[PDB]
């Protein structure tokens, strides 16, 4: 702590990561493979 070591935060918070895994799930469950290749 006296030593000039630091820990920077990630750009995407765990809240934002959980919103992406939610969108990937909701796309997969409602629309199959289609949201990977065009509109859902």
């Amino acid at each position: 702590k006296f030593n000039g070591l630091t820990v920077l935060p990630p750009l995407l918070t765990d809240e934002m990561i959980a919103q992406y895994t939610s969108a990937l799930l909701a796309g997969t469950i409602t629309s199959g493979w289609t949201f990977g290749a065009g509109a859902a």
Binding site: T6, V7, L8, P9, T13
Partner: peptide, 29 residues
Amino acid sequence: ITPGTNTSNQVAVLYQGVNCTEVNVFQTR
């Protein structure tokens, strides 16, 4: 830390949530 030219000057002081009271002003995570 700083941004560029048209995006003029305005700086970040890179604390681990430790306050801005050491230094518009906006405390940030």
